[PDB]
Amino acid sequence: VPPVQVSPLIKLGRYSALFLGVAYGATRYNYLKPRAEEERRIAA
Amino acid sequence: LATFWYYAKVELVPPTPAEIPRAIQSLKKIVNSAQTGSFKQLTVKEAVLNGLVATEVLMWFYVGEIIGKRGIIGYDV
Amino acid sequence: LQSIIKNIWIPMKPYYTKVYQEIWIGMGLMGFIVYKIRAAD
Amino acid sequence: VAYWRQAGLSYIRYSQICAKAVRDALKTEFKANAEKTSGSNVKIV
Amino acid sequence: EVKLGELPSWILMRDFSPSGIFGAFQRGYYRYYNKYINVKKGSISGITMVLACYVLFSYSFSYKHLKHERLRKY
Amino acid sequence: QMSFTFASPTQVFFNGANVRQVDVPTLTGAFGILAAHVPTLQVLRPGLVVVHAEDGTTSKYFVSSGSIAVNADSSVQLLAEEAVTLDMLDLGAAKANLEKAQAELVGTADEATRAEIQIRIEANEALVKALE
Amino acid sequence: DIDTAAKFIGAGAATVGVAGSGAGIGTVFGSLIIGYARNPSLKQQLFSYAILGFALSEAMGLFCLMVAFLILFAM
Amino acid sequence: DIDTAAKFIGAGAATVGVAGSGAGIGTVFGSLIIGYARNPSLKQQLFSYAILGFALSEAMGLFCLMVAFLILFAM
Amino acid sequence: DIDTAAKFIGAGAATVGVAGSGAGIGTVFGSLIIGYARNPSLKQQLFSYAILGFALSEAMGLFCLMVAFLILFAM
Amino acid sequence: DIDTAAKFIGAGAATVGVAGSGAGIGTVFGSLIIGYARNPSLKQQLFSYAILGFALSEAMGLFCLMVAFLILFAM
Amino acid sequence: DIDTAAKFIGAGAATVGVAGSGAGIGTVFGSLIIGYARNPSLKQQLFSYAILGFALSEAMGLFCLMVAFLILFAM
Amino acid sequence: DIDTAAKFIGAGAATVGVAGSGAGIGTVFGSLIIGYARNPSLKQQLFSYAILGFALSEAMGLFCLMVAFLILFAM
Amino acid sequence: DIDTAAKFIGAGAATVGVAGSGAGIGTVFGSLIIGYARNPSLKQQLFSYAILGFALSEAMGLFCLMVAFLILFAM
Amino acid sequence: DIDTAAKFIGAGAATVGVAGSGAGIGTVFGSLIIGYARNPSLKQQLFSYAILGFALSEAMGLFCLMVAFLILFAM
Amino acid sequence: PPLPEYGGKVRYGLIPEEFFQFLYPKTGVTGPYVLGTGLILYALSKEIYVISAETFTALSVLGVMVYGIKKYGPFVADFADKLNEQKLAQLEEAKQASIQHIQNA
Amino acid sequence: NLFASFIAPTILGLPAAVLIILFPPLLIPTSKYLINNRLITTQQWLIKLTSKQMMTMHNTKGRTWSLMLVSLIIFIATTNLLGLLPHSFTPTTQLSMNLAMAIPLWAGTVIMGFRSKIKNALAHFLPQGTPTPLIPMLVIIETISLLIQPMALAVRLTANITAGHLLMHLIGSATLAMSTINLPSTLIIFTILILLTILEIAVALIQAYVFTLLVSLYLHDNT
C-alpha cells in the first residue's frame, strides 16, 4: 500500500498539541508534587 | 517490524518548516467556514470524519501529557 | 394486536395451553414462595 | 450369566445365530461361497 | 439516511414512536446480521464484534464500582 | 514373546505368530492382550479383532463367536467360528437386518424365541458399529 | 466480637464437607474409566451415568458451600 | 453471646457429616457404571438399585443438615 | 453459659460420625449393583446380604446420633 | 466450668472416629456381595471372613466410643 | 485480637477440604492404570477421561483453598 | 484451668485418627473375601497377607491412640 | 498471646489435609499392583502412570503443608 | 496459658492426618491380596510394589506426626 | 435469495475494514492505529480503564478465546461447510432419483 | 467490595440486568432457508445433537417438552459462557433467577406426575424389593429428598458459577499484586489463571448440561 502524506494542518496540530501536553504534564507534575507530599505527611 | 517506519517516514514526521504556511492555510479556511457559518453544508459523513481527526490530535495532546509527567497510569504522585 | 398474537400467541398456544399447564401452576407456587420470602425481609 | 442363558439357550446356539447373522451381512460376492462352506447336512436319527 | 442528510429537522421527521424505534432496531439488526453473519463462508468476527460491544456495555454499568479501586488520586 | 494363533473352521489367519497386541470382544467385556498377559480363557461375542504386528501395523478382522485362551507360556489361541475381514461386509444389509430383528422383537411374545431375536439384534448392532 | 469471630470458624468448618465431593467425584470418573475400558461401545450411555453421578455428588458438596456462605454473610 | 456464637460452630461442624454422602453417592453411581458395562441388558433393574442406594445414602446426609439447621435456627 | 455453649459444639461434632455411614451405605449398595450384574440369578440372596450390611453400617451411624442427642438434650 | 465444657467437645470429637467403622463395615459387606456373586459355593467360608472383618473393623470403632465415654463420664 | 486469631483457625480448618482432592485424584489416576491395563488400545481416550476427572476433582479442592484465602486475607 | 480443658479437646481430636484404621481394616478383610473367592487354593497365603495388612493398618491407628493418651495423661 | 496461640491450632488443622494424600497414594500404588498383575508386559508404561498419579496426589498434600508452614512461621 | 493450651489442640488436630495413612495402607495391602489372587506367580514383584506404596503412603502419615510433635514440643 | 460469499472484512475481529478505509484519506494508513493507541492510553491514564483483577481475568479469557479461535477455527469452518455440501449432495441425488423413476415410467 | 460482580447492575438508574438476560438469544439466528450460513449450520447441528442426547430416553409424553429442555440448556449454556466475559454480570450467579428456573420446571414435573400416574407416583415413594421392617423409614426419606430437588437444582448452579467466577477473580487479583514482584511467579500464577479459565469454560457447559439433565430425569420419572 502506498502511503499518503498527511495535510500540514493535522501534522502541525498533532505536534503542537504534543508539545503542549509535555508542557502541561511537566507543569502539573511539579504542581501536584508539593501538595501530595504535604497530604501524605499530614495523613499520618 | 520495519514497515512501520516505512510508513512512519511519510505520515509520522515532525512537519518541515516549509509546510507550516499550508497548515495555517487550511487553518484560515476552517476559521473562514466558522465566520460565515457555512459548516452547515458539511453533511454528517465528513462531519464525523473531521470530528475523528479532532479527537486524534486531542489524543496526541494526552500522549504528550503522559510523557510530560514521566508516568503512564495517571500522575504517580 | 396484529402480528403480535400472530407471531407470539399462535406458535406458543400449543405450549401455553396444554404443555405448560403444570408449569404455570408451578410458577404461581414460585410467586407465592418469593412473595413469602420478600415479605419476611 | 447372560440373558439367553436364563432363557435356556447354549453357546452352541448363541454361536449359530451370531455366525448366521454375520454370514447374511456379507456382500453377495461372498455370500454364496460362505454359506456353502458353513452349511449343515447331518440329520439326527 | 444519516451520513447523507444535513438538516436538523431530520431528527423531528423521524418516527419517535414505540413501533418507530422498534422497526429502527429491527432494521439495524437485519442490516448487521446480513452483512456479517448471514453469508456463506462467513467468519467468526461477526460474533466477536457483538461480544466486544457486549463487554463494553458490561464495563459501562460496572464503572460505579470500579471507580473506587483507583490507583491514583489526582 | 507371545505366540498368537488366530484360526477359523476353514482358515488360519495366524499360526504361532509373534505379535505384540491383540484386541478381542469377550462376552465379559473387551480386553487387549500383550506378551506375558495373565492366563485367561473366555468366549467371544460379535465384534472386531485387531492384531498389532511388531512393525506397528494393524490388521482388523471381525469374528462372530468363538473362544480365546491366553496361556502361561504367553501363547494365545483365538478360534473364531466365522472370521471375515472387514472389507467383505456391507453396511446396508447390516442396518436392514437390524431393523427386521428389531421389528420381530416388538412382535414376538415367547421368552426363548425373543432371546434368539435379541441375540441376532446385538449381532447386527455390533456389525454396523464395527463397520463404520 | 465473639459472634463475628465464631462465624469464621463455623464457615471454615462447614467447608470441610466439600471433601466428600472431592472423593465422590473421583470415584465416578474413576469407575467411568474402568467401565468404559470393558465395554467401550457403551461410551455414550456410560458418560450419561457419570454426569448424573457427578451432579448428584457435587450436589451434596454445594450444600456445604451453601451453609459456609449462609453463616459467613447471611448471618 | 457465647450461645449465639457456639451455635455457629455447632451448625458448621454438623454439616461436615454431608461429606459422607458426597462419597457414598459417588460409589453408587460409580458401581452403576461398572455394573452396567458388564450386563447392559439389566440397565433398568440396575438403575432401580442405584436410586435406592442414592436415596438411602443421601438420607444419612440430610440427617446432618437436619441437626445443622436444628441448632442454627430451632435453638 | 459455658456448658450450654459447649453442648452445641459437642453435639455438632458427634454428628460427623454419621459421615461414616453415608460412605459405608454407598459401598454396600454399590457392591450389590456389581455383584448382581455378575450373577443376577442370586438377586434375592444378594439383596438379603445388602440389607444386613445396610443395617450393620447404619447401626454405627445411629450410635453417633445417639451421643449427638445424649449431649444436646439428655445433658 | 471450663472443664465440664471441654468434656463435651472432647467427647464429641472422639465420636467422629466411629465414621471409620461406618465406612469399613460397608466395604466388608460390600466385598462379600462381590465375592459371593463370583463363587457362590464358598458362601459359608466367605461369610466367616466377613464377620472376622466386621468384628476387627468395629473394634477400632468402639475404641473411639471408649474414649468418648472415658472423657464424658469417667473424667 | 479475637478476630485476627479466629481467622487462623478458620483458614486452617477450610484447608482440610483439600484432603478430599488428594484422595479423589488418587482414585482417578488409579483407575486409569487399571482401565488401561485392560484395554491399552484406548489409551488416548482413557487419558482424556482422567484429565476430565482430575480437573473436576481438584475443582472441589480449590474451592476450599478459595475459602482458606478468602478468610485469611480478604477478611 | 485452660490447660486441663484443652487436654480434653486435644485428646478427643487425636482419637478421630482411629477412623482411618476402621476403614483401612475393612478394605483388607474385604479384599481377602474377594481375593479368596477367586483363588480359594491360596487361602493360607492370602490370609498371611491380610494379617500383615491388618497390622500395618492398625499400626497407624494406635499411633493416634498414642497421642490421645500422651496428651490426656502424660501431659 | 491469642495470636501466637491460634497459630498452633491453625497450623495443626491444616496438616490434616495431608491425610488425603496418604490415602490417594495408597490407591495409586495399589492399582499399580492390580494393573501390573493383569498385564505385566506394560510394567514400564504402568509405572510411568503411577509416578504421574503419585506426584499429582502428593501435590495436593504439600499445598496443605504449605499453609501449615505459611501460618506457623510466615505469619 | 493460652499458648500452652492451644498447643494441645493444635497437636491433637494435626494427628488426625494419620487417618489418611490408616486408610491408604489398607488399600495397598488390600489390592495386594486381590492382585496376588489373580497372578500368584508375580508374588515377589507384587510385594515389591506394596512396600513402595506402603512407604509412600505412611510417608504422608508421618509428616502429620511431624507437625504434631513440632507443635507439642518444638514450640 | 442466495447468500453472499463473504462477510464484512473485519480486522482483529473487532474493527471492520470500513473504518480504516474511511480514515485512510485524511491521516493515511497508520491513522486508525494511532487513534487506537491514543484512545487506550488516555483511557488507562485518566483512570477511565482502572487496572484491577478483572484486567488479568480479561487477559486470560482473551488469551483462550484467541487461542480457541486460532486452533479450532478451521475445523469448525470446513465442518460447517462439509455439513452443507453433504446435505446438498444428498438432496441433488434425490433429485436424480425422481427423474430416473418417472423416466422409467 | 468483593461481590461487586454479583450486584444487580444498574446503568443510568435503569435496570441493565433486563438487557443482559434478554441478550443470549440474540446469538441464535434462525432461517427459513434450507442451506444457510456457518453459524446457523453448526448451531442447527448442536441443537440436533443435544435433542438426541436428551430426548431419546423419553416416551411420547416426555418428548413433548423437547422444546423447553433444549431451549433451557441453550439458554443456560449461553448465559454461563457469556458470563466468562470480563466485567460481565452473569445472571446465573443470581439465586433469584436460578430459583425462578428451577422452581417452575421441578414443580411442573411433579404436578404432571401427580395428576395422572398418581398410584405409580405414590408407589415410586417405595422401591420394589424393600423389606417390611424398613418400609416406614424409607418414605419420610424420599419426600424430604423430593422436596430439596428444586433447591438442589438452583443452588448447584448458583454456587458453582459464583464460586468459579470469584475464584478466577481472586487468582487474578494475585497476579496483579504479583506484577511488581518476582516476574516468573507472575507467569506461574498467570498460567494457573489460564488453566482455571479453561476449567470454567468446561464447568459452564457442564453446569448447563447438568441442570438440564436433572430436569430431564425428573421429567422421565413422571412420564
Side-chain angles (χ1 to χ4, degrees), chain F residues 41-102:
Chain F
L41 69 89
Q42 308 279 328
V43 281
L44 325 174
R45 86 189 157 211
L48 283 149
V49 163
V50 185
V51 181
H52 300 273
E54 278 291 335
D55 57 5
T57 75
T58 74
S59 317
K60 298 172 67 180
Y61 314 86
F62 184 95
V63 309
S64 61
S65 48
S67 88
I68 185 71
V70 193
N71 274 123
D73 50 11
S74 301
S75 57
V76 189
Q77 289 97 21
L78 171 52
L79 305 178
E81 175 176 20
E82 186 87 45
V84 295
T85 306
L86 209 51
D87 59 1
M88 293 173 32
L89 292 152
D90 73 326
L91 311 94
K95 299 167 181 47
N97 283 93
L98 179 49
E99 172 64 281
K100 312 176 182 181
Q102 279 148 342

Side-chain angles (χ1 to χ4, degrees), chain E residues 35 40 45 59 63 66 71 74, chain O residues 4-5 10 45 47-48 50:
Chain E
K35 181 176 183 297
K40 72 196 307 304
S45 177
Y59 187 59
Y63 199 59
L66 270 292
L71 173 46
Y74 295 140
Chain O
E5 196 210 348
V10 190
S45 45
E47 214 74 5
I48 288 302
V50 51

Side-chain angles (χ1 to χ4, degrees), chain H:
Chain H
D1 188 354
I2 208 170
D3 281 47
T4 313
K7 271 188 276 195
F8 289 155
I9 302 187
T15 319
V16 186
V18 179
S21 297
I25 285 178
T27 296
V28 171
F29 286 94
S31 299
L32 169 67
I33 292 183
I34 286 182
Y36 165 85
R38 131 145 309 181
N39 213 341
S41 75
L42 296 174
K43 160 183 183 168
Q44 298 273 2
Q45 174 52 81
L46 295 184
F47 202 101
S48 178
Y49 275 167
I51 298 299
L52 167 62
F54 161 81
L56 283 182
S57 192
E58 184 156 329
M60 309 312 296
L62 290 165
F63 286 178
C64 288
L65 278 197
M66 209 182 124
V67 182
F69 287 165
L70 202 159
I71 295 179
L72 202 53
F73 296 98
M75 289 192 123

Side-chain angles (χ1 to χ4, degrees), chain C:
Chain C
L1 298 105
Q2 50 71 33
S3 73
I4 318 303
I5 48 184
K6 188 253 292 182
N7 298 343
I8 316 304
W9 183 65
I10 314 168
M12 319 292 300
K13 194 205 92 54
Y15 308 100
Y16 287 13
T17 70
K18 53 219 175 193
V19 191
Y20 296 167
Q21 272 292 351
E22 311 88 337
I23 294 310
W24 320 122
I25 317 303
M27 181 159 311
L29 172 149
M30 184 264 280
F32 159 68
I33 274 174
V34 63
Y35 284 169
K36 248 190 186 174
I37 279 183
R38 296 178 75 241
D41 206 80

Side-chain angles (χ1 to χ4, degrees), chain G residues 4-46:
Chain G
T4 313
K7 271 188 276 195
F8 289 155
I9 302 187
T15 319
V16 186
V18 179
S21 297
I25 285 178
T27 296
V28 171
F29 286 95
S31 299
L32 169 67
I33 292 183
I34 286 182
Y36 165 85
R38 297 174 193 179
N39 213 341
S41 75
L42 296 174
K43 160 183 183 169
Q44 298 273 2
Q45 174 52 81
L46 295 184

Side-chain angles (χ1 to χ4, degrees), chain P residues 19-135:
Chain P
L19 184 150
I20 303 185
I21 302 197
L22 290 171
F23 184 90
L26 204 67
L27 309 154
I28 308 154
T30 46
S31 69
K32 301 298 165 324
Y33 281 7
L34 173 140
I35 292 171
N36 53 9
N37 49 65
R38 275 158 155 170
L39 171 57
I40 314 172
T41 290
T42 46
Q43 295 196 166
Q44 274 200 1
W45 173 71
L46 276 154
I47 300 167
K48 177 164 59 57
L49 212 52
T50 295
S51 44
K52 275 191 58 54
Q53 191 170 2
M54 309 284 321
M55 300 299 114
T56 287
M57 52 176 307
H58 282 62
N59 55 357
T60 44
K61 184 184 192 187
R63 295 165 173 184
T64 49
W65 281 34
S66 167
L67 183 89
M68 174 89 261
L69 291 205
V70 161
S71 186
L72 173 64
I73 184 172
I74 284 285
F75 166 68
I76 294 179
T78 305
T79 285
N80 297 343
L81 277 194
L82 273 185
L84 297 166
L85 289 187
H87 310 81
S88 158
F89 165 79
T90 309
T92 44
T93 67
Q94 303 286 309
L95 177 76
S96 78
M97 164 165 151
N98 305 302
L99 278 173
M101 285 195 301
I103 288 171
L105 292 162
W106 165 82
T109 312
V110 295
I111 285 179
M112 87 187 300
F114 277 175
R115 278 167 39 161
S116 73
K117 188 164 167 332
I118 194 51
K119 296 329 301 171
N120 263 278
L122 301 202
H124 272 318
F125 271 51
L126 280 184
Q128 273 75 351
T130 316
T132 53
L134 261 51
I135 290 304

Side-chain angles (χ1 to χ4, degrees), chain F:
Chain F
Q1 174 74 12
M2 165 158 141
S3 53
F4 190 46
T5 295
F6 181 46
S8 172
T10 186
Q11 190 159 20
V12 289
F13 299 78
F14 295 83
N15 178 19
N18 292 124
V19 295
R20 68 159 290 268
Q21 199 204 315
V22 166
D23 299 18
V24 303
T26 292
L27 285 181
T28 74
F31 63 90
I33 304 147
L34 284 91
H37 183 287
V38 53
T40 194
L41 69 89
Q42 308 279 328
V43 281
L44 325 174
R45 86 189 157 211
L48 283 149
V49 163
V50 185
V51 181
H52 300 273
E54 278 291 335
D55 57 5
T57 75
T58 74
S59 317
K60 298 172 67 180
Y61 314 86
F62 184 95
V63 309
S64 61
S65 48
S67 88
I68 185 71
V70 193
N71 274 123
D73 50 11
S74 301
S75 57
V76 189
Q77 289 97 21
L78 171 52
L79 305 178
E81 175 176 20
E82 186 87 45
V84 295
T85 306
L86 209 51
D87 59 1
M88 293 173 32
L89 292 152
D90 73 326
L91 311 94
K95 299 167 181 47
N97 283 93
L98 179 49
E99 172 64 281
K100 312 176 182 181
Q102 279 148 342
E104 278 195 341
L105 162 62
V106 178
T108 199
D110 192 25
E111 181 196 30
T113 60
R114 179 179 300 207
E116 317 188 29
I117 304 302
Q118 268 278 358
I119 289 184
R120 192 163 64 259
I121 288 181
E122 320 165 358
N124 305 302
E125 317 194 339
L127 286 170
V128 307
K129 207 164 307 173
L131 277 167
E132 270 102 334

Side-chain angles (χ1 to χ4, degrees), chain N:
Chain N
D1 188 354
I2 208 170
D3 281 47
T4 313
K7 271 188 276 195
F8 289 155
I9 302 187
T15 319
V16 186
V18 179
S21 297
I25 285 178
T27 296
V28 171
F29 286 94
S31 299
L32 169 67
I33 292 183
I34 286 182
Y36 165 85
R38 296 190 179 121
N39 213 341
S41 75
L42 296 174
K43 160 183 183 168
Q44 298 273 2
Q45 174 52 81
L46 295 184
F47 202 101
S48 177
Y49 275 167
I51 298 298
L52 167 62
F54 161 81
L56 284 182
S57 192
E58 184 156 329
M60 309 312 296
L62 290 165
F63 286 178
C64 288
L65 278 197
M66 209 182 124
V67 182
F69 287 165
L70 202 159
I71 295 179
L72 202 53
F73 296 98
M75 289 192 123

